[PDB]
Design a protein around this nucleic acid. Sequence first.
RNA 1: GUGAGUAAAAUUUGG
RNA 2: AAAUCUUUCUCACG
Lengths: 515, 140, 316
Amino acid sequence: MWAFQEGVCKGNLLSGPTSMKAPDSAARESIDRASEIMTGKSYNAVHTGDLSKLPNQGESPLRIVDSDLYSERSCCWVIEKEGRVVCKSTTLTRGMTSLLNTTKCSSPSELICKVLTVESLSEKIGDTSVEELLSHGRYFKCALRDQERGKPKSRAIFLSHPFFRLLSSVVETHARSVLSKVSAVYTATASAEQRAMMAAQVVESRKHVLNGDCTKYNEAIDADTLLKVWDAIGMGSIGVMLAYMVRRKCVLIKDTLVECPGGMLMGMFNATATLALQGTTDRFLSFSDDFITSFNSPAELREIEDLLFASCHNLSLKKSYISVASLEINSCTLTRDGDLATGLGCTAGVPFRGPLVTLKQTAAMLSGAVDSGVMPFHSAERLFQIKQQECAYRYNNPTYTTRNEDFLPTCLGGKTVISFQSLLTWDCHPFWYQVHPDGPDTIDQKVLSVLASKTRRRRTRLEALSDLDPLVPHRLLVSESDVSKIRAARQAHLKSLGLEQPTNFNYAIYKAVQP
Amino acid sequence: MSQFGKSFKGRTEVTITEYRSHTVKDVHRSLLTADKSLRKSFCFRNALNQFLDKDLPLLPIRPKLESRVAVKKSKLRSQLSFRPGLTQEEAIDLYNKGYDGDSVSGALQDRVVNEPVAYSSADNDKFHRGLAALGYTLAD
Amino acid sequence: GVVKVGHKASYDAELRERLLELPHPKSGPKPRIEWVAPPRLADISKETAELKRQYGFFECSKFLACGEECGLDQEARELILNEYARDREFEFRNGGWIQRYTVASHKPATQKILPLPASAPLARELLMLIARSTTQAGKVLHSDNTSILAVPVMRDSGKHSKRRPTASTHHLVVGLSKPGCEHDFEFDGYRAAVHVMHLDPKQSANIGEQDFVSTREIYKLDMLELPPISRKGDLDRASGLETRWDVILLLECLDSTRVSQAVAQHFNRHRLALSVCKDEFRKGYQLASEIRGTIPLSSLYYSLCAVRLRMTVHPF
RNA sequence: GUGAGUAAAAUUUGG
RNA sequence: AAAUCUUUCUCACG
Ligand SMILES: [Zn+2]
């Protein structure tokens, strides 16, 4: 069916591939490819271009974002039981907390300052030294990345040490700032479609367009290139430590450690690897491993190929192609005039993952498609009605509901099938406000979040500290007594006004209801 | 002894961000196991029962959108919509009323949203989410 | 006094020396890139013919035949499924069936290409039953026009091996179809074909969550006329059926590898391409080594058939 | 059902 | 037995 579309269709209407295969084979294959490239027989991993045009940020103060250093996402924490090294897959929050406990620091900024201000590698920062931190930060764990459309054989992603995460965060923030300075298309506030229009404007002058991709992009970016870029932008010793950890990195495959001298392990650094190419020329619009340039004559094509080779961006012969009337970037296809190409394009379907969340996601998808002119409004209305009927068929059973209220959706025992226009204009019962794309979270979303919070890796016996006063900054240091006092005061205040829990606040509804 | 001592061993003072990161329960990820989790122990059924009788009769009834203007198809462009944040006094009042502190605190930040649109009007006005085709204008 | 990013530490020189002593990459060969016109119809035809020759076909459509009614009512379907389960010596416990295994051959199951049934009117019911059963395994699940049975597969160890499944236990899904293949089964005057599929929890969850009706309706908005096809996917104007396309869509939902998405992306590149690398763009259509199994192989073959039919009926 | 041990307990699976 | 290194945990209390 995707083959018989009048316009452009990428076949995104079904969910991506998934399976339970172990990640050993994929990680081993990636490591073998990296080793082969390091041998210098398959692809080029030596950088030849000049990066003298990148501004030096060595005078910028060292600033660390605390929020991105804590997350529910997985990470690897290394411990020493009896001299040997044991890698445990934990949450980034627990890993960072363990690192801070081991080094006895109040915040990551203090830790990095202490690390950068030691007299020797053997000097002790708490119970460890910089040498031990560097030794531990070179261990990685492997997992499988699934649900990637167009990848029947899933690839391998890697979990790193909290110290590695800290240094990577600093260096990537600075590299992203430099990229934004270099060109306007790399601004922080820019959607994929807007970057596509900017690309169309950039490459409009010339005749042929080269829609290209890189092959083995992560394996062909050596630590030497990263060090070169970081020196070009002036990272000081942080870049040296990162390069040293990358060069000596080890990967835990199943139950054995494997050395991986070459590569950067599946996109740990995107801004740096993009600067590797953007710092040598301006006739490119690279976005990591998906670039687009323009040319007029075969001579310019030869210059483009030489530029790509010299900057370790190995062109992919299996996907790269040349166009005259189309423009592909970030999986988005436009015309040479910047108009969106007719057809489904990147429109993706919504799988069944809840009676209400499915409707919210369908509403968001239909809103996106209609706003961009992909389909007319009446088609959106019909599709929303059909999805509502399908949800009623799937979820209208005693396992999920026992109600019969008229205003309820047909999938929860009610008899209401609202129209898309009615939902979008807020002309409905307040129970439907959650189904609006901009409304509050749905019941099933809250239930799933609460269930996730109780999982083995995230379960904690600590006293939750929520409903904080808006004034108190998140950098203020607290202790057990402080948390107890704040919680008790908030509980007393809530009880004094006839409430047990705080009432959810929604920005859109609040603003609308305001006088 | 205390769980604080066990978690943050060796430290008697930790930042609020780190403390909260150990008790975050408002993050949702769409995964394949959604239906199984919802079916387990009739958790969604119980949550719906609780919502229909404890939380539902507190949502304010906001008014519907009325203003709309004629629009015609045009070149794809990016619409920038600026939503301001709560002021300090407004945040304090909302907190003292009894609203969730986290939501009010997060609403303080000013926000800007970029949306692609393929429709326009004579006066070049900004439209609502998913209604640019019909022409419902933000009027702000 | 404030520490800056470019700060130089006392160990900078030592770390730089250590990095220098460590191994470095060797310059790689410069590639030679030749640009030629995109592949023609003959190339897709060659790919399809090579797949057909290498793998062949099955006699019946196996589980893909479960998209059509078996011709039996609810009680007969339940009886047939239960008696089939009892025949194969499935353990019975707490009112549910369990399949027990002891040793594994550690070899891939034979894979061929499934011929397309005439139509799949019961696709939605089948997907719903697959979604529901894996979370309610053990008993027979019924719908308006079809039924299935999900049997957990657990190891045999002795007196007390395992009584309930875990988060990783696989499931054998058993469905009914019209008789007329080597998988027939007869009991008390009832005849039906019983077909099985081995699915791990992730595959079952992926398959069951797809929206057949909405996907088809969205595809129909901007679609060209679909030609009739034969059981082998070849254009058969005289005796082909346009409903087989629905079956193809159903197959795309059953295949958890979703190789059709890779074929669709490559076809999108092909349609927009004015010039491609010689002998390399064509290789993007050879995905036989990326997948293993009957269902993914059939999905890939029929995606290639669809590409060929598009190039044949509506050349671009 | 809870809690804990395990290079691991399904928000699994990172940038 | 099959979409074949996958269908593989332990302990204490109520
Ligand atoms: Zn058969």
